[PDB]
Swiss-Prot record, chain A:
The gene is INTS10. It comes from Homo sapiens (Human). Component of the integrator complex, a multiprotein complex that terminates RNA polymerase II (Pol II) transcription in the promoter-proximal region of genes. Signal peptide: none annotated. This is Integrator complex subunit 10. Component of the Integrator complex, composed of core subunits INTS1, INTS2, INTS3, INTS4, INTS5, INTS6, INTS7, INTS8, INTS9/RC74, INTS10, INTS11/CPSF3L, INTS12, INTS13, INTS14 and INTS15. The core complex associates with protein phosphatase 2A subunits PPP2CA and PPP2R1A, to form the Integrator-PP2A (INTAC) complex. INTS10 is part of the tail subcomplex, composed of INTS10, INTS13, INTS14 and INTS15. It comes from the Eukaryota. Belongs to the Integrator subunit 10 family. It is found in: Nucleus. The chain holds residues 1 to 142 of 710 of the full protein.
From Swiss-Prot, chain B:
Component of the Integrator complex, composed of core subunits INTS1, INTS2, INTS3, INTS4, INTS5, INTS6, INTS7, INTS8, INTS9/RC74, INTS10, INTS11/CPSF3L, INTS12, INTS13, INTS14 and INTS15. The core complex associates with protein phosphatase 2A subunits PPP2CA and PPP2R1A, to form the Integrator-PP2A (INTAC) complex. INTS15 is part of the tail subcomplex, composed of INTS10, INTS13, INTS14 and INTS15. It comes from Homo sapiens (Human). The keyword Coiled coil does not apply. Belongs to the Integrator subunit 15 family. One of its GO terms (cellular component) is integrator complex. It is found in: Nucleus; Chromosome. This is Integrator complex subunit 15.
From Swiss-Prot, chain C:
Coiled coil: none annotated. Component of the Integrator complex, composed of core subunits INTS1, INTS2, INTS3, INTS4, INTS5, INTS6, INTS7, INTS8, INTS9/RC74, INTS10, INTS11/CPSF3L, INTS12, INTS13, INTS14 and INTS15. The core complex associates with protein phosphatase 2A subunits PPP2CA and PPP2R1A, to form the Integrator-PP2A (INTAC) complex. INTS4 is part of the RNA endonuclease subcomplex, composed of INTS4, INTS9, INTS11 and inositol hexakisphosphate (InsP6). Interacts with BRAT1; interaction is required for the assembly of the RNA endonuclease subcomplex. It comes from the Eukaryota. Changing R75A: Decreased processing activity of the Integrator complex. Component of the integrator complex, a multiprotein complex that terminates RNA polymerase II (Pol II) transcription in the promoter-proximal region of genes. This is Integrator complex subunit 4. It is found in: Nucleus; Cytoplasm. HEAT repeats lie at residues 24-59, 60-93. It comes from Homo sapiens. The chain holds residues 122 to 241 of 963 of the full protein. Belongs to the Integrator subunit 4 family.
Length: 142, 372, 106
């Protein structure tokens, strides 16, 4: 009803049985009111971080809301940027292609928007140059 | 009409059905535009009974030709005519007598013929008949429609091995029929017998419905407001809570009082319940900003109370040790469905309706937490 | 440049790879460079490259080895078949498509 702590406890319990009881995961991550946004940190992110088709849409729409509410998750953008340099080889091998697809599964515009935060704080010369090149490629007049 | 039925019954070798269809189309040409809903006209009911059920306006009358092969040929010709009639009037007159009462002496044979003809028409890709089948339960009795649809589904899948894929393809091509079959599936999923437990083909059909029939459910919800405890049949395709409660409690209720089929399929039943819950949550998310109205909130119409009562009846005898997990899962699934439905904004009460309904629900930690 | 030295160096690379089977990245580098020198005109170089592909390989490699069932030099063909056999012995599940290729070689 309105017991936000009970909602968080139910979300945690559903996360505990997430590998088996997937119905409670959907019912808890999509449970409005109470500690809904508080529970949308590992429940929704689990679908977002999944290797299935969920990452195509959930990560490009639900992770953006979390980033707006709290922009503290830059690991995905950094990992994608690192994998991008090494993704130009072993195309015939299935593992390299799978890793490259997992890195690039997120939308290009969403990935650039998320990595703009790292770009502003890119103290490293190589990181700053890579960020500037990515910004120029995405938008030549930026 | 007795005279028209007798006149059209002659020449059963692919000519009687054509004449009957022509006469019915001539009679109901205005009816095709006035109100082409799934209703049975008493004028062409006798013709349909005579040319298909081998029974004229009198129940004890002489059958048309020798029946059997001649009756089969007439049924095939009538199905071909109705599918190509391009009007819902003829198909509705032919098929609607199966479950919607007609108040006729020969209404039982006419109903059997209409059920066979509707099954053929669905298999003969007669889109108007399948589309009107959704409207059939909107104002006619729902129990009879559910029974007829369940019988047709069982004939397609259980009796005919491998034809279930054709039924799923038709349901994809006729989403109105697929949505109308959700209530029939829920009625046939009481877990009181082995057939009540869905098979692998039934699971595939359910997956197909979850993928496609949800759009039909949303379209129906947009067509008319979501009413709470509608007249005799709404056919809203929202029996998710009852189906989930039955499927989760299948290895418990079935074992309490066949039992082995539901007990060994605990993983399959859980997967089907999870898929149904996911489909219901997706539908609720789609029908969340849409004008789905309040008042009712969760789609129960007292079916949640019947499911809770059914679970509680078996929850005291042999459930606490053998299948306590199944009962807990059923209660949690019902509460989760209620909460997710309230998450769409339809249920404008965090604990008012919950205290009104969920207070009498059985004991479950997950369900109690979800409710409160 | 020379073919004998190239074949002997491929033998050395095979020895190093067999000395470090738990190392993965090393074996991917080794199979890549074996594929690179797999088109040499010397049958010995192709033999050693196929031996590398047989002893070392992800478990694509079957197609690469399968391509050399039609090699003009018979001993390169034997080396390719032995490489596929050694891949199978290492635990790889060969494809049914190898059956028709082997049937021609009988």
């Amino acid at each position: 009803m309105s017991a936000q702590g009970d909602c968080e406890f139910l979300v945690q319990r559903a996360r505990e049985l997430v590998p088996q009881d997937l119905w409670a995961a959907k019912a808890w991550l999509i449970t409005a009111r109470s500690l809904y946004p508080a529970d949308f940190n590992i429940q929704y992110e689990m679908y977002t971080i999944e290797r299935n088709a969920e990452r195509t849409a959930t990560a490009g729409r639900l992770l953006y809301d979390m980033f707006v509410n709290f922009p503290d998750q830059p690991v995905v953008w950094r990992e994608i940027s690192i994998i991008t340099s090494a993704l130009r080889n072993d195309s015939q091998d299935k593992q390299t292609q799978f890793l490259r697809s997992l890195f690039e599964t997120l939308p290009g515009r969403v990935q650039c928007e998320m990595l703009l935060k790292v770009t502003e704080q890119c103290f490293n010369t190589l990181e700053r140059s890579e960020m500037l090149l990515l910004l120029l490629r995405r938008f030549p007049e930026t | 009409m007795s005279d028209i039925r007798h006149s059209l019954l002659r020449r059963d070798a692919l000519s009687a059905a054509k004449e009957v269809l022509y006469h019915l189309d001539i009679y109901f040409s205005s009816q095709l535009q006035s109100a082409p809903l799934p209703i049975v006209d008493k004028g062409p009911v006798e013709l349909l009974e005579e040319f298909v059920f081998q029974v004229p306006k009198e129940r004890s009358a002489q059958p048309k030709r020798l029946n059997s092969l001649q009756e089969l040929q007439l049924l095939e010709i009538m199905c071909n005519y109705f599918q190509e009639q391009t009007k819902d009037s003829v198909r509705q007159i032919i098929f609607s007598s199966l479950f919607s009462p007609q108040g006729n002496k020969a209404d039982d044979s006419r109903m059997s013929l209409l059920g066979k003809l509707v099954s053929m028409a669905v298999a003969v890709c007669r889109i108007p008949v399948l589309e009107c089948a959704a409207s059939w339960l909107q104002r006619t009795p729902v129990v009879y429609c559910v029974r007829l649809a369940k019988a047709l589904v069982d004939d397609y899948c259980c009796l005919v091995p491998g034809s279930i894929q054709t039924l799923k393809q038709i349901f994809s091509a006729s989403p109105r029929f697929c949505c109308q079959f959700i209530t029939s599936v829920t009625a046939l999923y009481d877990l009181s017998s082995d057939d009540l437990i869905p098979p692998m083909d039934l699971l595939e059909m359910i997956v197909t419905w979850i993928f496609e029939d949800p759009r039909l459910i949303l379209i129906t919800f947009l067509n008319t407001p979501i009413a709470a405890n509608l007249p005799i049949g709404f056919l809203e395709l929202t029996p998710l809570v009852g189906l989930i409660r039955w499927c989760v409690k299948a290895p418990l209720a079935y074992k309490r009082k066949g039992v082995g089929m539901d007990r060994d399929s605990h993983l399959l039943y859980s997967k089907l319940h999870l898929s149904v819950l996911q489909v219901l949550m997706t539908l609720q998310l789609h029908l969340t900003e849409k004008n789905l109205y309040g008042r009712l909130g969760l789609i129960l119409f007292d079916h949640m109370v019947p499911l809770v009562e059914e679970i509680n009846r078996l929850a005291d005898e042999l459930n606490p040790l053998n299948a306590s997990q199944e009962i807990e899962l059923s209660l949690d699934r019902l509460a989760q469905a209620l909460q997710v439905a309230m998450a769409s904004g339809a249920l404008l009460c965090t604990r008012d309706d919950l205290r009104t309904l969920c207070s009498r629900l059985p004991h479950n930690n997950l369900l109690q937490l979800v409710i409160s | 440049k020379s073919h004998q030295v190239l074949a002997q160096l491929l033998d050395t690379l095979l020895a190093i790879g067999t000395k470090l089977p738990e190392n993965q990245a090393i074996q991917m580098r080794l199979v890549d460079v074996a594929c690179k020198h797999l088109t040499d005109t010397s049958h010995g170089v192709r033999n050693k490259c196929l031996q590398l592909l047989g002893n070392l390989g992800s478990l694509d490699v079957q197609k690469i080895i399968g391509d050399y069932f039609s090699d003009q030099d018979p001993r390169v063909r034997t080396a390719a078949i032995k490489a596929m056999l050694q891949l199978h012995e290492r635990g790889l599940k060969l494809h049914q498509t190898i059956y028709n290729q082997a049937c021609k070689l009988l």
